[PDB]
Design a protein around this ligand. Structure first.
Ligand SMILES: CC(=O)O[C@H]1C(=O)[C@@]2(C)[C@H]([C@H](OC(=O)c3ccccc3)[C@]3(O)C[C@H](OC(=O)[C@H](O)[C@@H](NC(=O)c4ccccc4)c4ccccc4)C(C)=C1C3(C)C)[C@]1(OC(C)=O)CO[C@@H]1C[C@@H]2O
Ligand SMILES: Nc1nc2c(ncn2[C@@H]2O[C@H](COP(=O)(O)OP(=O)(O)OP(=O)(O)O)[C@@H](O)[C@H]2O)c(=O)[nH]1
Ligand SMILES: Nc1ncnc2c1ncn2[C@@H]1O[C@H](COP(=O)(O)OP(=O)(O)NP(=O)(O)O)[C@@H](O)[C@H]1O
Ligand SMILES: Nc1nc2c(ncn2[C@@H]2O[C@H](COP(=O)(O)OP(=O)(O)O)[C@@H](O)[C@H]2O)c(=O)[nH]1
Ligand SMILES: [Mg+2]
Lengths: 360, 440, 429
């Protein structure tokens, strides 16, 4: 009935370095991102001061720059530069903690290109913890609050999808052929030979996260020296049952999935090439499959069949994107022109979830 | 001097080039082995062939051409055929498979493994040119090679040359006829290269030439050879002023100056009027007025578009043979009296005219008849936008479901490009609608 | 330059491959001893696609013959073209699969897969540029389905960016020579949907119908069915070996015909099929070929295209013909039969033309269709599979070799998902 999938876009603030590197022309860099409202975004606005001389030509007198590069994107949730991590945590992932504590599944996606600020958001600094830390902290506080009349159990897994193959991050020894997706008759999906862990507090959860991230399949010489070539899926299974209630053979189950997505890549950036072309191709295909799945799920018509089997990532989250499960998507974008083209692609990827035509 | 460098990319480009170089060799007396008998017979030293050939000391005339394809088949046909001894052995081939009809392979993955060699050979050719006029690029919009690799090559050439002219002679998809399912994608993705890196792009449709062959030449079963020969005649008409004498000579710069009003409106329509079989060569006068009238007939256009649904922005009439200027003036006055041929209010002059004394040469085994007169008309008009709009509709049918997109994104192409190109095309259409509007 | 590695697995695959190599050798002028005695220079121009040159001006096919019993190897060796193959490429065991998918995939094929892959690796690095692979087998059996799927998986792991074709013989509802065909077919389609770029589905029922009606044969044998399949196989690869006006390699057909990654199960067909004593009564021209390709009776997959819509078609012509005629004939087929073509693809027909027809014909054409009617085949298998799996009829023979019921459930679910995906693009929308 309602839109279970919600898209959140966050605009980062210029770094002092970038803020003084080429913005001096304003007194070359310019803020291609403009924010008007909690659901409104303008890409490449015509806000430059010496600009009348250009539309003196764009209008029908000299057809050299008649192209209009201003785009108008609408999203469910928008965060400006001034908003801090508390507002993002409250407005994107905090409600999901209810559903997982209620019994339903929940999903969080993190997407962006290099320099977009995704790391600061999901991970953050020790002084300014990210979204994951706040979610797990409130989850454990809720568990302690509900320690009476109910018992909760937390299981943690952390896998990665690389070249359409699953690879345990917490137990790197396991071979891929062993890691296989299995669909039970309970409409639950389990990956074989997963190294499940029982952390006791958010400190242990973060320690497991860094231990896994130490193993992630990265490669150097890309715009970032530690770019990710895989989709990292962290799964927190909450299994709970009444403590002093009916002692029956029934305990309720839920999962919180947190997926850090690899950024799309244009080989044109790559020159030497090799197996990295295969990595890029797999990443782009997986992102396309995920976009198709999300667009079909949002669309009331095409969802008679949703292409879950086009990629391992969508197959794993078959029962974590539909109507019952609540999905949120944090898409971190930069306002600097240095990342112009990439940002547009990011803004085009988020928009696909719901093609809200802003011409109206 | 007046050199021109021809670049033939893909199967369509190479086959059009086969026709073109057959025609040029016949025009200048050069034999397929590259030797000119007239040099030893008459004595030589009073001929102009440098526009398309380079002479060595031994008397061999090597064409100024660069044949490129990502598969060996068509070029291998060229190196085993009659003209094996004509071209320099450096005819470029990727030692791997083709682009498989997708822009990503021709641009990003498979096309980067010969671009250095192609640019090196273009360097070696241009260094031998003292008076280089421009590049003649032949390709097809609907092909993976002829879209991706031509885009990459023209990006590189614009970076390296910039000032030199660049002329495209491209095969555009027909409205109904097609020979691949992913033609709209490749052609839309080719909008950037033909809008920002070209200087005058000529578009041709196979269906239009098929209808011309049926109606005029009386050929119910034409193959691609006839299409290529007709395109070769058009290109010969364009470059005749750089090779032969005439009353009014029109080089590339004058032609572009007279035909391109703004930097973006450089997509004219070609028309060769006296396409006539030998049987119908008799029973017809083929005067200058008749041929000039035939140029403006919608049935004779080489793109499936109706000029009556648009306003002519400029016209260039390039005549060959026995043509006097007063006959051309009378024909142009007759055309201006006609009301169905509408001109924009801001081009009162309208017509550029060139005349050349060299009549067209007939290829043995060809379909065109021997005619004392000929004309090539190059018309900048607003009707061509229709030919784009149809193609855009096809794109909008496939991209809605993201069909065939995984092939492209799995070869180093971001998804957003598919939208971006479309937007560019839409912008171009708007410009073509905003120039025909009359002044206030 | 565009080298293909051919792998034969099982009785059906080995027999089709032997007939296919006879056909290709006749096409290229290679005699049974491996010597070239052709009449034109085009045969040797692209002989490297399917053959390797041996020292005495000999040509050894780049074939790999696989089985779990030596009977079919002995049959192929003693055949007319048995002496042309490399003896080291003959890889075989001694204990057969027994019409068991588990034996040829877990127990007895797993032992031989290392040798087969060693030979595949040897035949791959000897190529200047490897276009792809070419597997011939049947899904209704043991060693065929099992070892073919295992080799598919391991080659796909080793050569992820190369084409992998598959000429797989589907089981039929009427014709049934084996009782446990549904299990094997489901377990093999579970593997083909994930690790193949082109799967050319063939049915013995459709080939027998072609023999009885089109060819008017009285006593068809497996030689004739292999003849038809080999004709199609040669037609698919024609543009990699001969020049033409429009060239189309395997990857071009895959790009044009596969709108989404999982919809790569194609129905083949061969155009000029006529009975002897009825060839003088027809004019072999492009319209006749075009009318024969799109006829329901000419398909080799035992499906009615009228029960579905064509997602895509590919027509690969051979011979001297005009491109105008082919273009109008395809446009006429699409406009006249608009109900059998999807609306959200404007042109549904990839077209390729080659300049060299087969040996005794002035022209020919190969049809490769991707339609929703193929759905029916999978549906039929399910209608058998469930009927045998609700009761666990012949299941202990599989579970005894390490398999589980989870694999059967997974394969059934994947096949039903494929059926649903094909059904999605059928109704008007
Ligand atoms: C008088 C005449 O025209 O002779 C024809 C012929 O009569 C017909 C009936 C042939 C004939 O085919 C059959 O009888 C046949 C029987 C069962 C299954 C398949 C074919 C022919 O045998 C088949 C043979 O075909 C070839 O030679 C092709 O090159 C074919 N290769 C082989 O048949 C072959 C097999 C083993 C060893 C060497 C060659 C081929 C087809 C596709 C792609 C590559 C090659 C031809 C021309 C004829 C005969 C001889 C009677 C037909 O065959 C083909 C494949 O075109 C059957 O209907 C067609 C149309 C022909 O008119
Ligand atoms: N006029 C004309 N058009 C041709 C000719 N050959 C091919 N074409 C057109 O080219 C279009 C398809 O593009 P191709 O030329 O096949 O692409 P390609 O150059 O081979 O590039 P690849 O796909 O990578 O091999 C078809 O729609 C044909 O109409 C020709 O000889 N003359
Ligand atoms: N949303 C933000 N709010 C405040 N500072 C930010 C924000 N995003 C980025 N920054 C600052 O800018 C720096 C560069 O961005 P950073 O977050 O490091 O990119 P990233 O997340 O590593 N890129 P990627 O992982 O590819 O998405 C950060 O280290 C912060 O100092
Ligand atoms: N076309 C063809 N089909 C065959 C042949 N032999 C068997 N078949 C089919 O294949 C099935 C048997 O599979 P088979 O290949 O013998 O199993 P395998 O030995 O384990 O690979 C039967 O249902 C037959 O319909 C043959 O020679 N030609
Ligand atoms: Mg080609």
């Amino acid at each position: 009935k309602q839109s279970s999938i919600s898209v959140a876009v966050r605009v980062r603030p210029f770094t002092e370095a970038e803020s003084n590197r080429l913005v001096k022309i304003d007194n070359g860099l310019r803020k291609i991102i403009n924010v008007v409202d909690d659901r409104m975004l303008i890409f490449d606005p015509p806000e430059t001061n010496p600009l009348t001389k250009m539309q003196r030509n764009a209008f029908p007198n000299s057809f050299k720059g008649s192209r209009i590069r201003e785009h108008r994107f609408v999203f469910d949730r928008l965060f400006d530069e001034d908003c801090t991590q508390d507002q993002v945590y409250r407005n994107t992932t905090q409600p999901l903690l209810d559903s997982v504590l209620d019994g339903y599944n929940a999903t969080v996606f993190a997407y962006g290109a290099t320099g977009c600020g995704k790391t600061h958001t999901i991970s953050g600094t020790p002084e300014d913890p990210g979204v994951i830390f706040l979610t797990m902290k409130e989850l454990y506080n809720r568990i302690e609050e509900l320690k009476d009349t109910k018992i909760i159990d937390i299981s943690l897994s952390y896998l990665e999808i690389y070249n359409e193959t699953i690879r345990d991050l917490l137990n790197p020894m396991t071979q891929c052929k062993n890691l296989v997706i299995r669909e039970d008759a309970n409409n639950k999906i389990s990956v074989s030979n997963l190294s499940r862990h029982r952390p006791n507090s958010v400190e242990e959860v973060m320690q497991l996260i860094l231990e896994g991230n130490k193993n992630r399949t990265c490669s150097p010489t890309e715009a970032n020296a530690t770019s990710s070539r895989s989709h990292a899926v962290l799964q927190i299974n909450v299994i709970q049952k009444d403590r002093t209630g009916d002692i029956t053979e029934e305990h309720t189950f839920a999962t919180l999935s947190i997926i850090d997505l690899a950024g799309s890549e244009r080989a044109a950036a790559t020159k030497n090439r090799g197996a990295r072309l295969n990595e890029g191709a797999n990443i782009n295909k997986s992102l396309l499959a995920l976009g198709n799945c999300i667009n079909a799920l949002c669309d009331p018509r095409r969802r008679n069949h949703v292409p879950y089997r086009d990629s391992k990532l969508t197959r794993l989250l078959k029962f974590s994107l539909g109507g019952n499960c609540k999905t949120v998507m944090i898409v971190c974008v930069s306002p600097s022109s240095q990342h112009y083209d990439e940002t547009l692609n990011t803004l085009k990827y988020a928009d696909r979830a719901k093609e809200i035509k802003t011409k109206l | 001097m007046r050199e021109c460098i021809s670049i033939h990319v893909g199967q369509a480009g190479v086959q059009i080039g086969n026709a073109c170089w057959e025609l040029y060799c016949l025009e200048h007396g050069i034999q397929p082995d590259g030797q000119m008998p007239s040099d030893k017979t008459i004595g030589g030293g009073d001929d102009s062939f440098n526009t398309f050939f380079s002479e060595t000391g031994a008397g061999k005339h090597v064409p100024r051409a660069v044949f490129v394809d990502l598969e060996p088949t068509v070029i291998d046909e060229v190196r085993t055929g009659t003209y094996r001894q004509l071209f320099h052995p450096e005819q470029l081939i990727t030692g791997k498979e083709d682009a498989a009809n997708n822009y990503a392979r021709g641009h990003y993955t498979i096309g980067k493994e010969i671009i250095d060699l192609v640019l090196d050979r273009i360097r070696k050719l241009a260094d031998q040119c003292t008076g280089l006029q421009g590049f003649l690029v032949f390709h097809s919009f609907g092909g993976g090679t002829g879209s991706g690799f031509t885009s990459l090559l023209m990006e590189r050439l614009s970076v390296d040359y910039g000032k030199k002219s660049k002329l495209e002679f491209s095969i555009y998809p027909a409205p109904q006829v097609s020979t691949a399912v992913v033609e709209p994608y490749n052609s839309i993705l080719t909008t950037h290269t033909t809008l920002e890196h070209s200087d005058c792009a000529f578009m041709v449709d196979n269906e239009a030439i098929y209808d011309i062959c049926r109606r005029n030449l009386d050929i119910e079963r034409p193959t691609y050879t006839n299409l290529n020969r007709l395109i070769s005649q058009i290109v010969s008409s364009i470059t005749a002023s750089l090779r032969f004498d005439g009353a009014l000579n029109v080089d590339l710069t004058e032609f572009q100056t007279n035909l391109v009003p703004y930097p973006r409106i450089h997509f004219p329509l070609a028309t060769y009027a006296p396409v006539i079989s030998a049987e119908k060569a008799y029973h017809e006068q083929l005067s200058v007025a008749e041929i000039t009238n035939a140029c403006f007939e919608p049935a004779n256009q080489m793109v499936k578009c109706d000029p009556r649904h648009g306003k002519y922005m400029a016209c260039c009439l390039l005549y060959r043979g026995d043509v006097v200027p007063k006959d051309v003036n009378a024909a142009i006055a007759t055309i201006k009296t006609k009301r169905s041929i509408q001109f924009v209010d801001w081009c009162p002059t309208g017509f550029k005219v060139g005349i050349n004394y060299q009549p067209p040469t007939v290829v043995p085994g060809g379909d065109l008849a021997k005619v004392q007169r000929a004309v090539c008309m190059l018309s900048n008009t607003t009707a061509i936008a229709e030919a784009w709009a149809r193609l855009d509709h096809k794109f909008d049918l496939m991209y809605a479901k993201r069909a065939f997109v995984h092939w492209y994104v799995g070869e180093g192409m971001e998804e957003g490009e598919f939208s971006e190109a479309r937007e560019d095309m839409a912008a171009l259409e708007k410009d073509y609608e905003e120039v025909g509007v009359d002044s206030v | 330059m565009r080298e293909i590695v051919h792998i034969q697995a099982g009785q059906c695959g080995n027999q089709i491959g032997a007939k296919f190599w006879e056909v290709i050798s006749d096409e290229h002028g290679i005699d049974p001893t491996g010597s070239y005695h052709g009449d034109s220079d085009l045969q040797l121009e692209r002989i490297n696609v399917y053959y390797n040159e041996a020292t005495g001006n000999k040509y050894v096919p780049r074939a790999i013959l696989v089985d779990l019993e030596p009977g079919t190897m002995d049959s192929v060796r003693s055949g007319p073209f048995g002496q042309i193959f490399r003896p080291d490429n003959f890889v075989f065991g001694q204990s057969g699969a027994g019409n068991n998918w588990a034996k040829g995939h877990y127990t007895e094929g797993a032992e031989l897969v290392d040798s087969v892959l060693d030979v595949v690796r040897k035949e791959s690095e000897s190529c200047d540029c490897l276009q792809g692979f070419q597997l011939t087998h049947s899904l209704g059996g043991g060693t065929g389905s099992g070892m073919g799927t295992l080799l598919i998986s391991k080659i796909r792991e080793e050569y992820p960016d190369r084409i992998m074709n598959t000429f797989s013989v589907m089981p039929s509802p009427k014709v049934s020579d084996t009782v446990v065909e549904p299990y094997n077919a489901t377990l093999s389609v579970h593997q083909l949907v994930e690790n193949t770029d082109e799967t050319y589905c063939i049915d013995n029922e459709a080939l027998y119908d072609i023999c009885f009606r089109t060819l008017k044969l009285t006593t068809p044998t497996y030689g004739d069915l292999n003849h038809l399949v080999s004709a199609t196989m040669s037609g698919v690869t024609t543009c990699l070996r001969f020049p033409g006006q429009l060239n189309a390699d395997l990857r071009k057909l895959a790009v044009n015909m596969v709108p989404f990654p999982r919809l790569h199960f194609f129905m083949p067909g061969f155009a000029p099929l006529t009975s002897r004593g009825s060839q003088q009564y027809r004019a072999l021209t492009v319209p006749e070929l075009t009318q024969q390709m799109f006829d329901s009776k000419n398909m080799m997959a035992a499906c009615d295209p009228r029960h579905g819509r064509y997602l895509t078609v590919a027509a690969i012509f051979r011979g001297r013909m005009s491109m105008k005629e082919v273009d109008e004939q395809m446009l006429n087929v699409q406009n006249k039969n608009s109900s059998y073509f999807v609306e959200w693809i404007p042109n549904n027909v990839k077209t390729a033309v080659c300049d060299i027809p087969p040996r005794g014909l002035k022209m020919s054409a190969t049809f490769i269709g991707n339609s929703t009617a193929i759905q029916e085949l999978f549906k039929r298998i399910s209608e058998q599979f469930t009927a045998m799996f609700r009761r666990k009829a012949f299941l202990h023979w599989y579970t005894g070799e390490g398999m589980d019921e989870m694999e059967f459930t997974e394969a059934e679910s994947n096949m039903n998902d494929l059926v649903s995906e094909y059904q999605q693009y059928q109704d008007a929308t």
